[PDB]
Amino acid sequence: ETTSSIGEKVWDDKDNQDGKRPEKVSVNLLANGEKVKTLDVTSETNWKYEFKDLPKYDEGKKIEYTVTEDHVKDYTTDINGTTITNKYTPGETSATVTKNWDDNNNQDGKRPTEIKVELYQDGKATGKTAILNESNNWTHTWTGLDEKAKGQQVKYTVEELTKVKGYTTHVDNNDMGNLITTNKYTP
């Protein structure tokens, strides 16, 4: 019926010795790969957060909840089921990608068991690939990405490599911390 997703953010930055830690981060809640809510997490909340009263099932099926964090400058993000860790990595950062299936559940069970996506840097393929499926809640996070390239901020985006007959593909690349790929079923 109803559940809740509680968690916290932990900073791994040598007790902010460099003084680069921000006053807040924004956590996104995803229901089956779709961003439905956001919350700003701060010290005032003690770096804790919780999404109250949420349905457990979506028309019988069990909704799969996950969380992502909007990109934080100079921090590499590691998400461990609700516990979000930000490691200070000056000049470097991470990127997270989730797959969103828009096909009214698998009605017309034509949904592939897995898909392959690739990370792109300023339009160039990086070679960094990921295979999204149920074993990883259709999510994956890459680390070790440069934030700059000869003084200019590098833009990261993802593209689906798998050709899914029947599905149209659209990608939201507005935040490297919450890159979302949605496949829409259109016979």
Add this chain to the structure above:
Amino acid sequence: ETTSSIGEKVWDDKDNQDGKRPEKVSVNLLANGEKVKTLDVTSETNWKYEFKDLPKYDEGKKIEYTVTEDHVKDYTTDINGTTITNKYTPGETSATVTKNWDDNNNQDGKRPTEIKVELYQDGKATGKTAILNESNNWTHTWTGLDEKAKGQQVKYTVEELTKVKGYTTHVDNNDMGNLITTNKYTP
């Protein structure tokens, strides 16, 4: 009265399966952050070297000897004591910087205790800073650095961000594998 440094060159490239291993490597001997001797190491010596007959003390202190390696295309260098490990990484390498204090073993007690340096890509700030101090031996190695940009080799340099009162700074940026920042005490 006399001392000597020995060590070995270790290759991590599936026994040169891609045939990119160079015929030799230049190992540098640093006496308290100052380059005092070089040595071309080959398989003729079994990738082992030795800087025999070295003064054990100099102007009041037991000299802190360290080794660095001249940049080798497509390999990422890792120094652990006198053991230099080179890993095969197509398209990227590492950069090593060492702080050289020239203040008569800090006789006047004006030495900082800590300084911050930053890696530059073709004269542009990368954001990748590092803090040098007595704990890490005033040395640091960055990895995952692209050797090329737009088809052209990239020039890597280091800049000292920390302003050191009473000191004048000079940087030797000739080889990214042996970047050396020198601070001379000029009251």
